[PDB]
């Protein structure tokens, strides 16, 4: 393989393009990189464990990995209190050590192994233009992805459960026993609108629906894996797509961009798969928490919170949603679709119930609302909490804010990468990625426009 | 020979005066829809209760606005992120009161500009060009999506979208500084470097080419007649331009390669606008600019102010005055 411009036509700043047709070095690149991902997982987990104060809420402490492990049900109890520090440490150590194994294997294949795998084995050696082998690799990796989704199902059903924030008695690690196998609910989540009140798949509000979706995903991915091992692409697919390594890269780039946007919105809105005991309140959660906190405070002073008009004529504490539901007032009218385990006990069939607001508010709901309104996902880049006009004394930016911003930006730049690699794949397959040929310039043969 | 193949050949035809293409089949209807509704709403739409507090803001020309103050006002805060098409309103007058034209125009416009980007790729493919003009156009698209879609999603209301007007744009900018300190956000700082530098490099490049034009005319006629469209020869002396600019600063600060120089011209403002679009898109989730309020304290602990503290006083003024009847509670949390 050429490791310079004169022998490849690619500069140093585009060097990894020198690997496109070197499958062994490409595999080593791919495997060393996986090393890196598992390395960050393990080392970041060990960092977060070392900096963790377990009696303090995770979201106060700049943690984005321990909430993921805690949502799986490890090292936590009721209300997300940390029982034991050892499962988080175990997850870190196992990733870190394995990452050493993956890094050694990538270096081998990259530096010492055969540069092309096609002269060594037909099973592992691939040509990008060989549609059967490409779909075989899709198929192997789909069976593995389905096995991973079924492993999440097995953790929730058979090996200790997941954290359910919606659990009666308070949020707790519970074992899922009746997952939603009903395909109407599971795929009607896919059919729901990506707008307010509907939320597409971001609105999944119970662990039974989540675990049932992963049974179906596991089944769908395993079936699609066998499909693609046993079959070859059909004529419409062969005539519709570009068949090259850069093309398949760009297809994956568009896919990754879509999932990055979905992940940013998921962590910004959903409090079920991202429980607020670990990630802190959502922005909608915190705004409704402030409205509830001052409803409770002024009700304790003797305000008639239902008959109180504000300055505009709308109700100061309670008002009507556009479909009529009894909701909190002020600007949080926007957030009347919010649902949370601290709030839903005060909701009736028509919305917020006057009787429950008068004589069913518990002290823990007040405590949770005060904590969530003061841990709103508002913060500066140097991690100064609250509104931006506040002074420097509160060191806090929400993990929801960090995760959402990161993945939105990642998703955008991966769309840019999709456009770049798709466009280049199209031009390279069509033969003009290196520029216009002067003799056969296509515009010089076209008629004039006017 | 089939009717469908004839339609495919017409749609993808390089002989069309305006290229349609398959992306154009989406772009033309959407952009025409958003343009028609925007013009009609800008001239004649009734006032819109943008803040959801029954205080309707007049945006159209016929209701007392001028060109500067006129806007298509964003949809109601009561709507939030809810989908509000015409058919979900009980009447057209209710749809107009609640800011439905904003949702119609924005949604069609955003589809239209994404299909404009795809159409730029498509024509580059049909002309045998390299395909990355659409990558450059992705930077204004990212900024438009940031202010019309992503910031409303993060803040939970289209009411927080940039209004479709001049003074509404200024209102959006000022309230954004009050709530996010975008001036102290390093990505806006890259945006500003992007546009300032892009204008600098536009002027330098244009000035260097115009400075080094080959003599092909008299001083009676315009120098632009020294260029013939489709001529094979270069119309300016790149070596003279390089010999000027590498003495203006020093030799290796100057591009001797026209391709390298044109890449730099393309890349610098595109990267800067990408960064500031991500700044607005991340301030959507309230990851705000730098807070250095009371960062400096004297040995006793008394605050020593900086220019950031004076800027913060300006931000307070905006904040405590904006949407002045909307807030019922001590914190502006969204």
């Amino acid at each position: 393989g050429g490791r310079d411009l004169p022998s490849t036509g690619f500069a140093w700043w585009s060097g990894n393009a020198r690997l496109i047709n070197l499958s062994g070095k490409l595999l080593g690149a791919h495997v060393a990189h996986a090393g890196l991902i598992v390395f960050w997982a393990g080392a970041m987990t060990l960092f977060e464990v070392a900096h963790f104060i377990p009696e303090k809420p995770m979201y106060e402490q700049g943690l984005i990995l321990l909430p993921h492990i805690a949502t799986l049900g490890w090292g936590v109890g009721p209300a997300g209190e940390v029982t034991d520090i050892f499962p988080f440490f175990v997850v870190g150590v196992l990733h870190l050590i394995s990452s050493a194994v993956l890094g050694l294997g990538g270096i081998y294949h990259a530096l010492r192994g055969p540069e092309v795998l096609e002269e060594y084995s037909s099973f592992f050696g691939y040509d990008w233009k060989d549609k059967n082998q490409m779909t075989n690799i899709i198929g192997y990796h789909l069976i593995l992805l389905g096995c991973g989704a079924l492993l999440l199902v097995f953790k929730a059903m058979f090996f200790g459960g997941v954290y359910d924030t919606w659990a009666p008695g308070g949020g707790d690690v519970r074992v899922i026993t009746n997952p939603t196998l009903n395909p109407a609910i599971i795929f009607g989540y896919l059919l729901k609108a990506p707008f307010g009140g509907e939320g597409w798949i971001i609105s999944v509000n119970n662990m039974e629906d989540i675990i049932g979706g992963h049974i179906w995903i596991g089944l769908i991915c395993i079936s699609g894996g066998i499909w693609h091992i046993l079959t070859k692409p059909f004529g419409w697919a062969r005539r519709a797509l570009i068949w090259s390594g850069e093309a398949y890269l760009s297809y994956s780039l568009g896919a990754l961009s879509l999932m990055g946007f979905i992940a940013s919105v998921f962590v910004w809105f959903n409090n079920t798969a991202y429980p607020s005991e670990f990630y802190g309140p959502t922005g909608m959660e915190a705004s409704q928490s402030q409205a509830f906190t001052f409803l409770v405070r002024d009700q304790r002073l003797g305000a008639n919170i239902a008959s109180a008009q504000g300055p505009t004529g709308l109700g100061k504490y309670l008002m009507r949603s556009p479909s009529g539901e009894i909701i909190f007032g002020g600007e949080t009218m926007r957030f009347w679709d919010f649902r949370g385990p601290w709030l839903e006990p005060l909701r009736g069939p028509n919305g917020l119930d006057l009787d429950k607001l008068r004589n069913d508010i518990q002290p823990w709901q007040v405590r949770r609302a005060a904590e969530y309104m003061t841990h709103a996902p508002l913060g500066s880049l140097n991690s100064v909490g609250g509104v931006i006009t506040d002074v420097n004394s509160f060191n806090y930016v929400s993990p929801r804010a960090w995760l959402a911003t990161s993945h939105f930006v990642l998703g955008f730049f991966f769309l840019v990468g999709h456009l770049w690699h798709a466009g280049r794949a199209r031009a390279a397959a069509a033969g003009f990625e290196k520029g216009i040929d002067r003799e056969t310039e296509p515009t010089l043969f076209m008629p004039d426009l006017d | 020979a089939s009717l469908w193949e004839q339609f495919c050949q017409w749609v993808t035809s390089t002989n069309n005066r305006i290229y349609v293409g398959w992306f154009g089949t989406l772009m033309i209807p959407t952009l025409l829809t958003a343009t028609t509704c925007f013009i009609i709403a800008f001239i004649a739409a009734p006032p819109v209760d943008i803040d959801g507090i029954r205080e309707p803001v007049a945006g159209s020309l016929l209701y007392g606005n001028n060109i500067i103050s006129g806007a298509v006002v964003p949809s109601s805060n009561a709507i939030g992120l809810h989908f509000y098409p015409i058919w979900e309103a009980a009447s057209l007058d209710e749809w107009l009161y609640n800011g439905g034209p904003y949702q119609l125009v924005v949604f069609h416009f955003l589809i239209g500009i994404f299909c404009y980007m795809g159409r730029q790729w498509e024509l580059s493919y049909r002309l045998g060009m390299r395909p990355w003009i659409c990558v450059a156009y992705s930077a204004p698209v990212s900024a438009a999506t940031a202010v019309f879609l992503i910031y409303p999603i993060g803040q939970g209301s289209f009411s927080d979208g940039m209004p479709l007007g001049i003074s509404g744009t200024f209102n959006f900018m000022i309230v954004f500084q009050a709530e996010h300190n975008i001036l102290m956000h390093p990505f806006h700082m890259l945006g500003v470097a992007g546009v300032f530098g892009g204008s600098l490099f536009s002027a330098m490049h244009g000035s260097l080419v115009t400075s080094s034009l080959v003599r092909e005319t008299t001083e009676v006629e315009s120098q632009n007649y020294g260029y013939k469209f489709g001529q094979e020869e270069e119309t300016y002396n790149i070596v003279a331009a390089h010999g000027y600019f590498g003495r203006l600063i020093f030799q290796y600060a100057s591009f001797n390669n026209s391709r390298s120089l044109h890449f730099f011209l393309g890349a610098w403002p595109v990267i800067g606008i990408w960064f500031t679009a991500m700044g607005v898109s991340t301030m959507a989730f309230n990851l705000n600019g730098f807070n250095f309020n009371q960062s400096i304290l004297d040995s006793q602990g008394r605050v020593i102010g900086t220019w950031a503290d004076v800027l913060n006083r300006a931000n307070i003024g905006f904040e405590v005055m904006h949407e002045r009847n909307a807030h019922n509670f001590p914190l502006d949390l969204a």
Binding site: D448, L449, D450 | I43, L61, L62, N66, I67, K228, F229, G230
Partner: peptide, 30 residues
Amino acid sequence: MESVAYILVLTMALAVLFFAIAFREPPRIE
């Protein structure tokens, strides 16, 4: 009646756009 003047200047700009596209000086290689 200031609305009439605003509509007129905006209409003049849009009409100039139409005539500048549909009846442009056609580029010719000579």
